[PDB]
Design a protein around this ligand. Sequence first.
Ligand SMILES: *[C@@H]1O[C@H](CO)[C@@H](O[C@@H]2O[C@H](CO)[C@@H](O[C@@H]3O[C@H](CO)[C@@H](O)[C@H](O)[C@H]3NC(C)=O)[C@H](O)[C@H]2NC(C)=O)[C@H](O)[C@H]1NC(C)=O
Ligand SMILES: *[C@@H]1O[C@H](CO)[C@@H](O[C@@H]2O[C@H](CO)[C@@H](O[C@@H]3O[C@H](CO)[C@@H](O)[C@H](O)[C@H]3NC(C)=O)[C@H](O)[C@H]2NC(C)=O)[C@H](O)[C@H]1NC(C)=O
Ligand SMILES: *[C@@H]1O[C@H](CO)[C@@H](O[C@@H]2O[C@H](CO)[C@@H](O)[C@H](O)[C@H]2NC(C)=O)[C@H](O)[C@H]1NC(C)=O
Ligand SMILES: *[C@@H]1O[C@H](CO)[C@@H](O[C@@H]2O[C@H](CO)[C@@H](O)[C@H](O)[C@H]2NC(C)=O)[C@H](O)[C@H]1NC(C)=O
Ligand code: TRP
Ligand code: TRP
Ligand code: NAG
Ligand code: NAG
Ligand code: NAG
Ligand code: NAG
Ligand code: NAG
Ligand code: NAG
Ligand code: NAG
Ligand code: NAG
Ligand code: CA
Ligand code: CA
Ligand code: CA
Ligand code: CA
Lengths: 779, 779
Amino acid sequence: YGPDQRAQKKGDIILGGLFPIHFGVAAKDQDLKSRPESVECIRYNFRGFRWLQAMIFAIEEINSSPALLPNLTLGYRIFDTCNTVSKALEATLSFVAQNKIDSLNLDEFCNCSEHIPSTIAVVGATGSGVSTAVANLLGLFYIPQVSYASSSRLLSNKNQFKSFLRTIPNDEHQATAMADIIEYFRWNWVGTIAADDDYGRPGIEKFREEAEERDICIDFSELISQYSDEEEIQHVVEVIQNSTAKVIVVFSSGPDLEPLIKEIVRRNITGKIWLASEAWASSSLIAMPQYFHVVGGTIGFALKAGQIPGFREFLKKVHPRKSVHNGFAKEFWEETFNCHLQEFRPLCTGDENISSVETPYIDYTHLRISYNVYLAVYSIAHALQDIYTCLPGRGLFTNGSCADIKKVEAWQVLKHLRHLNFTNNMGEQVTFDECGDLVGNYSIINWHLSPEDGSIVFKEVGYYNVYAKKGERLFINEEKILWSGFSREVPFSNCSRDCLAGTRKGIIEGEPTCCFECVECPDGEYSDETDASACNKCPDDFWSNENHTSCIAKEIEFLSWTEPFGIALTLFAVLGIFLTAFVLGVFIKFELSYLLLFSLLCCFSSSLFFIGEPQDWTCRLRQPAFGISFVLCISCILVKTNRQFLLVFLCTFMQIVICVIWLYTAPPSSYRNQELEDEIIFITCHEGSLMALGFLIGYTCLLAAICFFFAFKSRKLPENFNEAKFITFSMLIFFIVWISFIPAYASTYGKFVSAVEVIAILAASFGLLACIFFNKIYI
Amino acid sequence: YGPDQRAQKKGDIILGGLFPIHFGVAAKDQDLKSRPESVECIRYNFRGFRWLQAMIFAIEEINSSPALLPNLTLGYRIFDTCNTVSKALEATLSFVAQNKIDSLNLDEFCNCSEHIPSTIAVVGATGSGVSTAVANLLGLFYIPQVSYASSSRLLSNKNQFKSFLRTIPNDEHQATAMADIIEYFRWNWVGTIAADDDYGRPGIEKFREEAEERDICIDFSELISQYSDEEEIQHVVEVIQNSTAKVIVVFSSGPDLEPLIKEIVRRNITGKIWLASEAWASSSLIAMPQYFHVVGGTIGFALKAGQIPGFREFLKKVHPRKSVHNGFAKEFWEETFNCHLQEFRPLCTGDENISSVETPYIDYTHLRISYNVYLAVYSIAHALQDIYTCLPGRGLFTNGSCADIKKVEAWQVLKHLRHLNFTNNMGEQVTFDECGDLVGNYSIINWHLSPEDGSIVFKEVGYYNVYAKKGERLFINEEKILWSGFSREVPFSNCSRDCLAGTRKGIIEGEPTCCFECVECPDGEYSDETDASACNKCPDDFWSNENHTSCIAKEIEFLSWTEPFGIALTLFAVLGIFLTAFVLGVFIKFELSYLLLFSLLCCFSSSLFFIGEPQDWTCRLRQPAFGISFVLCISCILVKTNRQFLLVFLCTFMQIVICVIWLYTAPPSSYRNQELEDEIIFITCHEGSLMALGFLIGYTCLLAAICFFFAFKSRKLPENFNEAKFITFSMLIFFIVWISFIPAYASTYGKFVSAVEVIAILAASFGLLACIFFNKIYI
Ligand SMILES: *[C@@H]1O[C@H](CO)[C@@H](O[C@@H]2O[C@H](CO)[C@@H](O[C@@H]3O[C@H](CO)[C@@H](O)[C@H](O)[C@H]3NC(C)=O)[C@H](O)[C@H]2NC(C)=O)[C@H](O)[C@H]1NC(C)=O
Ligand SMILES: *[C@@H]1O[C@H](CO)[C@@H](O[C@@H]2O[C@H](CO)[C@@H](O[C@@H]3O[C@H](CO)[C@@H](O)[C@H](O)[C@H]3NC(C)=O)[C@H](O)[C@H]2NC(C)=O)[C@H](O)[C@H]1NC(C)=O
Ligand SMILES: *[C@@H]1O[C@H](CO)[C@@H](O[C@@H]2O[C@H](CO)[C@@H](O)[C@H](O)[C@H]2NC(C)=O)[C@H](O)[C@H]1NC(C)=O
Ligand SMILES: *[C@@H]1O[C@H](CO)[C@@H](O[C@@H]2O[C@H](CO)[C@@H](O)[C@H](O)[C@H]2NC(C)=O)[C@H](O)[C@H]1NC(C)=O
Ligand SMILES: N[C@@H](Cc1c[nH]c2ccccc12)C(=O)O
Ligand SMILES: N[C@@H](Cc1c[nH]c2ccccc12)C(=O)O
Ligand SMILES: *[C@@H]1O[C@H](CO)[C@@H](O)[C@H](O)[C@H]1NC(C)=O
Ligand SMILES: *[C@@H]1O[C@H](CO)[C@@H](O)[C@H](O)[C@H]1NC(C)=O
Ligand SMILES: *[C@@H]1O[C@H](CO)[C@@H](O)[C@H](O)[C@H]1NC(C)=O
Ligand SMILES: *[C@@H]1O[C@H](CO)[C@@H](O)[C@H](O)[C@H]1NC(C)=O
Ligand SMILES: *[C@@H]1O[C@H](CO)[C@@H](O)[C@H](O)[C@H]1NC(C)=O
Ligand SMILES: *[C@@H]1O[C@H](CO)[C@@H](O)[C@H](O)[C@H]1NC(C)=O
Ligand SMILES: *[C@@H]1O[C@H](CO)[C@@H](O)[C@H](O)[C@H]1NC(C)=O
Ligand SMILES: *[C@@H]1O[C@H](CO)[C@@H](O)[C@H](O)[C@H]1NC(C)=O
Ligand SMILES: [Ca+2]
Ligand SMILES: [Ca+2]
Ligand SMILES: [Ca+2]
Ligand SMILES: [Ca+2]
């Protein structure tokens, strides 16, 4: 009863089933003026008819093989749910009719003897919005429902759907796999689209939850349906166009993506790569050749294929007349041959060849969901077998006493179906968990266009092994992947382009972490990585390059010790020492000959002892350059004609006491200065407050000035061949040198702050011997 | 029939109803050894019994007032769904029993005359996981279901739930309101918790979708249930403890938050503020006084209260004996008085006072959902009224012919219920939209503890006007809000603390945009805002401050025009001019008196014409400082005793030709230099390649040196009171000055690169007159 398009066959134990022979109900909506009537289904699903044949075929195989359920035949009352909850509930209200005694004792059948004989276990409700609505009605009467296709995670809640097992993997793994793919191809800017029913809605939240532990920032997220209006479809395609993201993760069903794909083709939005859910990655509505402008390269998923023997030869044995136990055969015949079967449209002779036309009923390469239908009805058969072959004192019920077969109930088959452990025709073990589902391995496919009259071929490009360890589960042989149909290079679908090794990452306000700008950082930056979020600072003896990469450029070494700028002045000091020694020899052979020669040679020999990079001793040894000058300027008071002479320690010991007092105040330490930035590693010796200045003013500007007022009366007096005149000329040379010293010493730094003093001491002590020794010798 | 705890009363038109008298079914799960039986409900819901009394009371009011539905009495078959889909489906399978002809013609009642008289419109299914499961079964038979409490957005899909209207607002507005509150209090780091059924799951996705257009980054998102296990509850409280976010948006129901709230109290996780959904913000399971350590200050929502007259006096008229049409009264009596009614537990006399004990059945301050029950049954009455008072040729059905009352069907009441426009007892208009719901205004409450024996009082702190414009809908009078129970200051719940105006925002890799670090930016930074994501760069005449805020510090103005460093040298130049003029007057009164006085005064008067900030003319007027020196040094060849003399243009015109050729090569333009960074706005005049150097070497070092070999034979020759000797002394002064000029000119910059040349010209031209004019005058 119920609907009047059944597929019915009597038997001892009646199964029942629910299959999607059409794709939907008609678009007519009632205004409720007239009394409402049953809505008529519109499209046709040859894949759904193949699923129905796979159920019926395995029931004939169980009734054929006598090693499984002997002297007991299986019937079935297979209905058709046109992918709608109402058409499914009209069927599963006729499934539970004899069981409807427990609340309504007022059934009292009164229209049949066996009273619509009680279904033991229903196999069906493909959609997950349909299984959720049928498993609520098959949960009061405890009839087990073994669904072959519904694969949402809401149905794995065994406090509400108390009797629901399924032979298709959960979708907690597929939303992990679609994040592993996006992580593996190094994308971080994707968008999601999900069908608004119980399949896409809790299956895109798992992808959102598992693509933010990988940094898979989501761009947009829209929900579609198969009954959405034109404003909603236009809004979804405007969000697709208004964005810049090439990976679109579509977690939807077959005919829910149809109004979006039609309109995206009609508006020609090319470039995106569609990661596909399992429900539409092998679909005879989206894989159509004229959609291949926008739908190509769609890396999808598919379940593990099966092998059913004799099934393809059983599919061709169909007929609208020889099949008396199949009410859908006439509708399939008329829809596949464009006939009109008589018992615009020509009358059908009924002698056609089924292998002649091209249709998804017989043009298939792998059984994937049809094998799940076969496996579900074999699961119910292998539970009825264990009820059949149970010995007393051994079973599963209370006190081990198992139940009979001739009066078997639905909850006993549910109890045995929970504890199921059997083997297929492929040697695999099938067992339902505590949440009642199987576990399987996905085989990632790709959408290629066959270049000889073929529609679309699905080329397998890897797997997804769910048994392996977390992290190593995905294998993508990416030399078979044709990006957007024809290309070969992996497309760029990041948000902002990853900047180079000279720049850092700077963010925009109101945009995610996955989108930045990239600016350069200054002054000791050294962005050593490629995408560093903050470039560091260099060590103090290093400075950044021109391209702002790793700072291998060190700072200065400004010393000029043996350089060709200081070595020539050292040669001048050696020439002064040699010219002094050649006069000392002529003064020895041929106190003003001992001290005013020895300290005079010291003032020109220790003046070469202030070059190079200074240190503690080379920074404390600047005091002899004045202490020896104060003793070598004693000739101006010792060689005069106004001459008890060995009391030069009335000034030399004063200078020595000044030096011994000032060596603690002006410290014996070079001080490295930071005046420039790039190459500024200095050494400047940092005289304290007044020490060397007071020492110079009290010796080298005081003795030569106290000699000045004493020799100004003798400058116009020649004596001993004008010795006073030559002393005054050397004193004028010394005054010119000490006038030239101080401003050039004040207005220089570093390399040129010592080369003024060391040149001025040379220029004074060379004149103070060349004006005097030559005139005293050559006369 | 169905369940054997009904509330039944016969009548002409039977309504039906579904109410949550208990809170859930017992925790016993079947192992299916025994034959499974009906599970027994556990807790009690006095609020649910108040809702049942509000339905029954309005049915008595319709049967009482003769102005509404006269000569026609309303019955009801009210059942009890213990918040479970299975207990609701056992009831709504006994609602549709006479309507079960359309698919099963084999009903053929055979146990009643009227055959369980057909319910016209059911009122119930409070939960939104229960209304979704009952509206699928009341959508084949087109019975209208007017739910009073289910408020999810999945039920507003009129292609699947074809007959479902409701008198509670949708939850597309409440998830907007909870984002408006978080935006209004300036939070950006929240966490969400949602009950895993059809209420929290599509209601937290709307909050996630509307709290990322406001930048409301989400921290965590967990799903709970009332059947969750201890590992899941421990995981949720470990995510709450392991996070740092104080705003927790709980979108859940009453008894779904119970195992989380119990365990959070048992582990004492204090500090969080719980934004509440409407379902538990006024709940007699969470608002309990011992939970107030962690549950306080919970800014919730509540619907608009109603006024039902006579209802509180009707509630006290209940009795287990006088109520013959109410099967729940004995259970309510026994559960509220701890009795055991006879027809551990003492026997009940049945003479107690209902207003004596404290219970949520009678301790209420505002009718919110009870008014919705009243409004739903008045909606069905005001649709039956319009079927009653329809004139022919005027109705809503086909060709205007409306239907009778004595044979009325469910789809006619559905048609009239769609077109409903009536008025309450409060003067408000009630009309269902095209998606079949009402619109209402929320009244935001807060959870205060009453400090005299009270449990928890709910103090209203504002509203949420959904009729107003988008953006201005929320009004929070925040001087009534007690944060976490007692406090008064708004709590800080951002991710990272907003940094100051000296620093920028730097990001962390692997963390959202809402969390940053804050580093300082250098060298012309001027972070003018408070939380700028990138600090700008200053204009070139400005440099950054010490605190790196807005750069008001301008650069240098190094000129020294009228400063106390250049004005004293200008006074020295004026003194040189005056001392030259006083000698010119004594040479006039008492060509070497004309040219060697006029050009000599020019060389000391135009030497003050090179001070200040230079410009085109003040940078081209450096050439007279050599052109006048070459003409004023002509005295050294014009005043000698070896003296056709007016051919000084054999050198002065050569210098003039050099200047006229070099004024284009060395350009007349000051060049601003950038040698330092902070205060470095310079002017340096940028001599070209060799122009001034060659001019100086060809005039001022050439004439004085060609005079040298001519006057070296006359230096030992006194003539005209030693004029040659005084000329040689002035030439030695000039040679000393031009030896002191060049190194101090080379080793300075800017302010000290002109003050060396302008001092050296003064020192040369003062000596070249003071050595000569004084000896020529005073003799
Ligand atoms: C889109 O943005 C992505 C950021 O999420 C980029 O992903 C980055 O790719 C890098 C390779 O180009 C990865 O570097 C790897 O780092 C690990 C250590 O973390 C090393 O062992 C690997 O050797 C190294 N890879 C190579 C080739 O050297 C980054 O780790 C990775 N970022 C993250 C967060 O994982 C994408 O590159 C970018 N897209 C494009 C096209 O550039
Ligand atoms: C948590 O982070 C939030 C960032 O999302 C901070 O929110 C910022 O608060 C500022 C006020 O303190 C807002 O400034 C306002 O800016 C508008 C113009 O955009 C002006 O008209 C207002 O006058 C100005 N407010 C004041 C008081 O001057 C920021 O706009 C706002 N950020 C955003 C993105 O809106 C929170 O402040 C922060 N929490 C705490 C406690 O600081
Ligand atoms: C799951 O997928 C994997 C890979 O696609 C399959 O694992 C292989 O199984 C064969 C047969 O046992 C082994 O010889 C290989 O070594 C396996 N590959 C590995 C471990 O990488 C497996 O057949 C699939 N199906 C199931 C049910 O596990
Ligand atoms: C919705 O909420 C608002 C504010 O809580 C209420 O609006 C006020 O209504 C009264 C009566 O009409 C007016 O006098 C006020 O001016 C309104 N306030 C405004 C416009 O800010 C309103 O009563 C609530 N209910 C409905 C059904 O709108
Ligand atoms: N899991 C799918 C059902 C499904 C799997 N494969 C399919 C192929 C076609 C149609 C539906 C399916 C759903 O929830 O809807
Ligand atoms: N909308 C709630 C129903 C509800 C509203 N208020 C309530 C108060 C108590 C219990 C349930 C409710 C839900 O979907 O579940
Ligand atoms: C798309 O972008 C245009 C231009 O900014 C804008 O006008 C339009 O509203 C956008 N549409 C959507 C859906 O964002
Ligand atoms: C869509 O665009 C592609 C490439 O731009 C082009 O080949 C194709 O013909 C277009 N189709 C339509 C219908 O505009
Ligand atoms: C043993 O089995 C009988 C019926 O088979 C049952 O009534 C009884 O309770 C059982 N006893 C135990 C201890 O299991
Ligand atoms: C039962 O199933 C388990 C795995 O689920 C398997 O290891 C075991 O071999 C099965 N039992 C038998 C008897 O095959
Ligand atoms: C909480 O933090 C601790 C310490 O880092 C960690 O060991 C634990 O696994 C965390 N738990 C969760 C649920 O994040
Ligand atoms: C929980 O903590 C609060 C404050 O720390 C304290 O007042 C209260 O007594 C605690 N309760 C328990 C059970 O530890
Ligand atoms: C008028 O009404 C009759 C019955 O009331 C109906 O059969 C007929 O179709 C209607 N005609 C029009 C034009 O509405
Ligand atoms: C019908 O409802 C509208 C608003 O929905 C209201 O404006 C109008 O007044 C109502 N009709 C009557 C007759 O009150
Ligand atoms: Ca398909
Ligand atoms: Ca934003
Ligand atoms: Ca409650
Ligand atoms: Ca991260």
